[PDB]
Write a protein that binds this ligand. Structure first.
Ligand SMILES: *[C@@H]1O[C@H](CO)[C@@H](O)[C@H](O)[C@H]1NC(C)=O
Ligand SMILES: O[C@H]1[C@H]2[C@H](O)CCCN2C[C@H]1O
Ligand SMILES: [Zn+2]
Length: 1014
């Protein structure tokens, strides 16, 4: 295994280093506005060394943006694909590349058998080529690597089954900034090449000048370079035709033959395209070839890529003709005019890359190595696209919830083979596809029109229900005596109970377990643990009585705590935000212990009086002019008082101190240690009254944030033996700090209401001497070092915070883990800040056609980990990466993959069992079974189950961390006949494993295995 901590990789280009040196001056470079006047030696090419040009026709189809997926399909895409089939069929030399499989699958299944055959033939012969082959072209900032893999797998699995092809070249022309998580996944999925486009205009200029636009992209910690994937970065402002033929859009626009008038399109540079004729072909070619040769100067080989397309292009037959015919005339002339020394033709992406590597092998070019990412993107001036790191936060959070539900549903149902009548495969396919769809660069990004966002939400809602159905059916089968098991595949044996989604104050959705002497004395509940190690976690349920006790299936009592059900309300009368307690519903909390990838059953029983093993939390409402707060049967009376600072400590965990406004002020790790200053504060950013305005994509603040006026907020303090908390009703946010014995959990019920042109940020202020350094994660896969650059505007220093961020000095580190992707930064030494929501009245001119005024209450969740790191073995000062500690990693897992909770629906569960998976191996803490998916239906003689294993890297800080079993996923199911290592998509077998044993992976490595069972 490579050491991912102590060996600083030696690369030609390291993005953090490059950023440190670059000046980012935005000067007018001429026709190529953000570059310079490219010059070339005409004698460079000749009869013995020609420029090979590949014109690659394409059509960018968004699975939703300003129209829904179905609206686009009906109005544009089905016509684009229908005419592509016809035109390619009739013109053997014409080529076309396709990226979005969600659309292709929709189209193909609607085609008649005759057409399906014609389609398969033009793919087999190389005319129609799939690039990437994912369900969508995913966002690369907010997306979790697990979902990036899910959607890629969904698309490629379809392609393998119906088109008999697996793309090895990736095409990503629209994501707003690019992440190394892509080559990581692609390189481990059989890919050999990838192309990207949206990178900072300053980076394009810098790399172009050094001819480093094509490079071997390796991971920041990869010293050997085995993760390297050849990458081609386009050099210009856009992927449209005016910005793909060469440096001058005024000239290139003249070669987009769909802009002559009848199509309602034109050239903004005032020079329209002209139909090619024998009369003007020589002059037209001279102009075009000149653009090509200038573009060619930015690269190292004699093979040139020239994309030919735009949004939803190649729809009308007339369009296919006008583009094909005119280009055929140009090719015939150019290729027959020796003085040009050029050979041009229509080609595919793979054809381009094959030629490039042929030139490389011929020894005509050597490519530079590179590590780092391409965030934060800016397409011009100071317009940095850090706004979408936060836009539509409700759905960003929903993404993480569904991500987990999909994993849990696939894993729970993978243990058994199911009869087709159970509709298991059906529901899981729907769930995977709706989640995959949302990974689109206009989905999770929060950059779609209001009604499209609604469509995505509806789709995810159906996916969640599908997951629940599969999960509950699975639990019933796994925990019921076999000879008693009698399933009704349409029946709900269990109801999922989720305390954090949609969340309290967002939607009263969770059911109350109703118990009573005259109706029902007890109720069974079951917890599921998708993680491959034994896990304990507090779980809570709503009950109709405070007099409830918990026991496991062995009838062993389990210590529990009951607390009231508090709901915050904006009192329109008193103009105050205060909590009201329920007099009929209560929360019971207890510690559940679940086997690795297993289940554990408990029983809740009601009694006439306070049970022996159940304690009751005290409650203190701090505020002036208080009013009574009755709580029905609740044992203890609420106490009141004027606002004041308070301190709390649960178990032997840390001691937290709060201000009289209910905000964190300090953290004391141990009774000995000091009170480390850690202050939470809420501020607000505005919008500029002059110039460019912030929108769904752009973050253009009118200066540093201003503190939110808090007034005299109402603070609620709940103190319990197992869980305590401090909640405060602030303007736009009910802020809550929950303690259970370890790092606190933070929950924000964010309702920006009608505060137009406002962006709410949550900031942490400390004494940590971090300087200008901070760390953020990329797709929940790795942590990359960031350097605040004062030479860049505030918005440029904002980065994606998909799952976590941290700052540290020689001795102390503060890590904030998230349960949803949001935007954030460290604008000053010792600070961390992350945006909660943003409401913008104006459009930011990128095509959306609207601002963001559809905000809705969302419950954001976090874990705040303060730790001493002076004893940790960390990377040298020059290493571009950072790594989490065991505590921080486990805290992240508690947010993204918590225990699942099931409530038995009927009055009695006959044949109930108390546990499943007690014999499952408990793997080392840095290892996870990211995916467990049965790949075969019940009719298959040889069953196959696929596993994706990921091992992260945790810092060694002196903790022994011992006794853990080796995890061999190939033996998780009985009767294993073979074990094979496969690509992450499970589509290609890479190794036949002896002894049928799947070995664990190295730190920061991800592998996939498929076990076959007879
Ligand atoms: C799939 O493509 C491969 C090319 O390697 C070919 O050998 C095989 O026969 C094809 N299978 C079909 C008919 O889909
Ligand atoms: O995705 C749509 C849009 C993005 O939302 C912002 C950049 C320009 N893009 C072109 C469209 O495909
Ligand atoms: Zn797009």
């Amino acid at each position: 295994c490579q050491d991912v901590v102590q060996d600083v990789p030696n690369v030609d280009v390291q993005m953090l280093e490059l950023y440190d040196r670059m000046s980012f001056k935005d000067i007018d470079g001429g026709v190529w506005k953000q570059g310079w006047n490219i010059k070339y030696d005409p004698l460079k090419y000749n009869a013995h060394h020609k420029l090979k040009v590949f014109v690659v026709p394409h059509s960018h189809n968004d699975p939703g943006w300003i129209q829904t997926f179905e609206e686009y399909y009906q109005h544009d895409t089905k016509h684009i694909l229908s005419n592509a089939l016809r035109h390619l069929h009739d013109n053997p030399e014409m080529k076309f590349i396709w990226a979005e499989i969600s659309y292709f699958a929709r189209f193909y299944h609607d085609l008649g058998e005759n057409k399906k055959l014609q389609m398969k033939s033009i793919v087999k012969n190389g005319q129609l080529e799939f690039v990437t082959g994912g369900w969508v072209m995913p966002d690369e900032a907010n997306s979790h690597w697990r979902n990036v893999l899910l959607q890629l797998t969904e698309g490629q699995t379809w392609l393998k089954q119906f088109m008999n092809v697996t793309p090895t070249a990736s095409w990503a022309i629209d994501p707003f900034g690019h992440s190394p998580t892509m080559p990581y996944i692609l390189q481990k999925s059989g890919f050999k090449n990838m192309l990207i486009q949206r990178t900072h205009y300053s980076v394009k200029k810098e790399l172009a000048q050094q001819r480093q636009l094509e490079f071997l992209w390796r991971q920041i910690w990869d010293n050997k370079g085995d993760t390297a994937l050849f990458t081609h970065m386009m050099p210009f402002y856009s992927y449209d035709i005016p910005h793909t033929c060469g440096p001058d859009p005024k000239v290139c626009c003249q070669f987009d033959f769909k802009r002559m008038g009848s199509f309602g399109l034109s050239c903004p540079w005032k020079v329209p395209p002209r139909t090619i004729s024998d009369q003007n072909v020589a002059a037209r070619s001279d102009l075009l070839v000149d653009q090509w040769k200038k573009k060619a100067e930015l690269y190292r080989t004699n093979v040139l890529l020239i994309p030919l397309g735009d949004d939803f292009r190649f729809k009308q037959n007339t369009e296919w003709d006008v583009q094909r015919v005119n280009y055929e005339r140009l090719f015939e002339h150019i290729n027959s005019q020796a003085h040009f020394n050029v050979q041009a033709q229509f080609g595919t992406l793979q054809e381009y890359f094959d030629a490039v590597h042929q030139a490389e092998r011929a020894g005509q070019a050597e490519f530079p190595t590179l590590s780092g990412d391409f965030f934060t993107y800016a397409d011009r001036s100071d317009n940095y696209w850090s706004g979408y790191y936060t836009s539509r936060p409700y759905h960003k959070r929903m993404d993480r919830v569904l991500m987990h539900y999909v994993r849990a549903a696939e894993m729970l149902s993978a243990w058994h083979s199911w009869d087709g009548m159970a509709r298991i495969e059906e529901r899981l396919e729907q769930a995977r596809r709706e989640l995959s769809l949302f990974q689109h660069h206009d989905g999770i990004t929060g950059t779609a029109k209001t009604h499209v966002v609604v469509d995505y939400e509806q789709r995810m809602q159906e996916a969640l229900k599908a997951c629940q159905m599969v999960m509950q059916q699975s639990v019933y089968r796994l925990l019921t005596k076999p000879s008693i098991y009698s399933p009704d595949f349409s029946f709900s044996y269990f109801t999922l109970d989720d305390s954090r989604w949609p969340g309290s104050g967002v939607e009263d959705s969770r059911t109350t377990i109703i118990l009573g002497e005259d109706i029902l004395p007890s109720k069974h509940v079951v917890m599921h643990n998708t993680l491959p190690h034994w896990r304990e976690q507090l779980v809570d349920f709503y009950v109709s009585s405070p007099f409830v006790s918990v026991t496991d299936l062995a009838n062993n009592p389990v210590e529990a705590q009951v607390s009231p059900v508090w709901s915050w309300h904006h009192d329109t009368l008193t103009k105050t935000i205060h909590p009201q307690g329920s007099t009929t519903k209560y929360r019971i909390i207890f510690k559940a212990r679940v086997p690795p990838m297993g289940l554990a059953t408990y029983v809740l029983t009601i009694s006439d009086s306070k049970p022996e093993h159940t304690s009751y939390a005290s409650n203190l409402l701090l505020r002036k002019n208080p009013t009574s707060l009755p709580l029905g049967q609740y044992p203890e009376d609420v106490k009141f008082g004027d606002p004041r600072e308070i301190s709390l400590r649960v178990g032997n965990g840390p001691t937290l101190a709060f201000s009289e406004q209910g905000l964190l002020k300090s953290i004391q790790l141990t009774q000995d240690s000091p009170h480390v200053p850690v202050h939470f504060k809420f501020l607000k950013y505005g919008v500029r009254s002059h110039g460019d305005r912030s929108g769904a994509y752009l973050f253009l603040p009118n200066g540093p944030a201003s503190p939110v006026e808090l007034g005299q907020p109402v603070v609620l303090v709940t103190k319990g033996k197992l869980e305590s908390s401090v909640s405060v009703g602030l303007p736009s946010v009910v802020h809550q700090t929950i303690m259970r014995g370890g790092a606190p959990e933070i929950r924000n019920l964010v309702d920006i209401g009608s505060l137009d042109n406002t962006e709410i940020v949550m900031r942490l202020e400390t004494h940590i001497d971090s300087g200008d350094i901070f760390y953020t994660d990329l797709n929940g896969l790795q942590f990359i070092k960031r350097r605040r650059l004062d030479k860049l505007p505030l918005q440029a220093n904002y980065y994606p915070i998909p799952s976590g961020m941290f700052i540290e000095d020689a001795n102390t580190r503060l890590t904030l883990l998230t349960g949803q992707p949001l935007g954030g930064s460290s604008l000053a030494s010792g600070e961390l800040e992350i945006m909660q929501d943003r409401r913008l009245a104006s459009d930011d001119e990128r095509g959306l056609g609207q601002g963001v005024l559809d905000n809705k209450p969302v419950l954001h969740i976090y874990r705040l980990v303060l730790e001493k790191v002076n004893n940790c073995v960390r990377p040298s000062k020059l290493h571009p990466a950072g790594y989490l500690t065991s505590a921080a990693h486990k805290a992240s897992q508690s947010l993204l993959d918590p225990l699942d909770k099931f409530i038995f629906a009927e009055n009695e569960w006959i044949g109930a069992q108390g546990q499943f998976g007690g014999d499952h191996p408990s793997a080392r803490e840095d290892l996870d079974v990211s995916v467990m998916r049965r790949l075969t239906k019940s009719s298959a003689k040889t069953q196959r189950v696929g596993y994706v294993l990921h091992r992260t890297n945790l810092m060694q800080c002196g903790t022994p961390e011992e006794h853990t079993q080796k995890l061999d996923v190939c033996h998780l199911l009985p009767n294993v006949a073979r074990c094979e290592r496969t690509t992450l998509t499970f589509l290609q077998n890479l190794e036949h494993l002896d002894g049928m044993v799947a070995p664990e992976v190295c730190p920061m490595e991800t592998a996939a295995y498929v076990s076959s069972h007879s």
